[PDB]
Amino acid sequence: ALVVVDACKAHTKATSFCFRVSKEKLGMGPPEIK
Amino acid sequence: CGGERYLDFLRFAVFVNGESVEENANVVVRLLIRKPECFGPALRGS
Amino acid sequence: RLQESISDFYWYYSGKDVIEEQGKRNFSKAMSVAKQVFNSLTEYIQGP
Amino acid sequence: QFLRTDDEVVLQCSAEQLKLCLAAEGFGNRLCFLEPTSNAQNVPPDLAICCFTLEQSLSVRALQEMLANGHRTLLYGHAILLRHAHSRMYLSCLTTSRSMTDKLAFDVGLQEDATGEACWWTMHPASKQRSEGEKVRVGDDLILVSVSSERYLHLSTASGELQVDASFMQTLWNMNPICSCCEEGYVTGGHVLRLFHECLTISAQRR
Amino acid sequence: MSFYAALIDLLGRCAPEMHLIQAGKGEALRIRAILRSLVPLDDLVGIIS
Incomplete structure (x- = not known):
């Protein structure tokens, strides 16, 4: 969640993270991340 | 008393001249066990 | 439907060594109709 | 669009409507259980014990x-052998009975031995729309039938919570392929991986 | 009881003979495993007694 939290109190608003290349002001999946 | 008339019908198909057939006995056991209501309400449980 | 029936007829006779006159009767019966539908299919596509 | 050999699937049912993915722990408590997964908005489920791969697919007289x-x-109409992804063993139907009510239901659980008497499962269509000899789609309700014991893997609502059993009740299940054949060199979801930059690790209450 | 005795002996006459159990037929011991587990033994030991 930066700490790790138990599974019962883990929510969508508590634990949800993402992967991006850079922060600017903005079938199977496509192979974007290597 | 009503369903006993259908059960003594099916002894004549699965048992002929004192020897049991294999093809008709395989298909009547396969058909009876998918429906639990064809048995009595005790075995379906007392 | 005819492919899976003759193929399962082969898998039933895959363990036995020889075939009796009953089995080669039914196999030539199934292969002759299989040739007729093969002749029915090619004349559908022999025209351009 | 159509399932293949070597795709990881998750067996789930419907029961408000709530999906119960069939997950198996392994190395302890081999009898399978079910998981609530419509409530992912408040609690995340564990799908690492639900990945089942289809290793081989044969016919009835081919087995x-x-x-x-x-x-x-x-x-x-074909047979299929579902094998677990964490524990690398087969989902079969053992001879025991844990219902204790003479309902003639065998419990379904995992096996290490590769005997194909009880490890194989045969499919059947739900409705008259599809018959024998068609191909399976994503999201079609299927009916798995055991070979040796000849019962159907269904959801039992008799005693307590919802559990799985092999009995003579038809209950429809969804295959839902969770992972197809992935190209090497790209990340997918569910992968066990590290975060090298040093490693992002914990101490040996470790929060 | 007339329905149940018609139910029981029907389950007896559809049972395979001894020479199918003596062979390696996986079908015959499957049917005998269903009918032995459909109807228990000691219930019949009490009824015959």
Whole structure:
């Protein structure tokens, strides 16, 4: 969640993270991340 | 008393001249066990 | 439907060594109709 | 669009409507259980114990001579051998009975031995829309039938919570392929991986 | 009881003979495993007594 939290109190608003290349002001999946 | 008339019908198909057939006995056991209501309400449980 | 029936007829006779006159009767019966539908299919596509 | 051999699937049912993915722990408590997964908005489920891969797909008389002794698209009426992804063993139907009510239901659980008497499962269509000899789609309700014991893997609502059993009740299940054949060199979801930059790790209450 | 005795002996006459159990037929011991587990033994030991 930066700490790790138990599974019962883990929510969508508590634990949800993402992967991006850079922060600017903005079938199977496509192979974007290597 | 009503369903006993259908059960003594099916002894004549699965048992002929004192020897049991294999093809008709395989298909009547396969058909009876998918429906639990064809048995009595005790075995379906007392 | 005819492919899976003759193929399962082969898998039933895959363990036995020889075939009796009953089995080669039914196999030539199934292969002759299989040739007729093969002749029915090619004349559908022999025209351009 | 159509399932193949070597795709990881998750067996789930419907019961408000709530999906119960069939997950198996392994190395302890081999009898399978079910998981609530419509409530992912408040609690996340564990799908690492739900990945089941389809290793081989044969027909009915094709398995018969093998017990007597790459990617193939499976059809209706065929057999399938589901194998777990964490514990690498087969989902079969054992001889025991844990219902204790003489309902004639065998419990379904995992096996290490590769005997194909009880490890194989045959599919059947739900409705008259699809018959034997068609190919399976994503999201079609299927009916798995055991070979040796000849019962159907269904959801039991008799005693307590919802559990799985092999009995003579037809309950429809969804296959839902969770992972197809992935190209090497790209991340997918569910992968066990590290975060090298040093490693992002914990101490040996470790929060 | 007339329905149940017609139910029981029907389950008896559809049972395979001894020479199918003596062979390696996986079908015959499957049917005998269903009918032995459909109807228990000691219930019949009490009824015959």
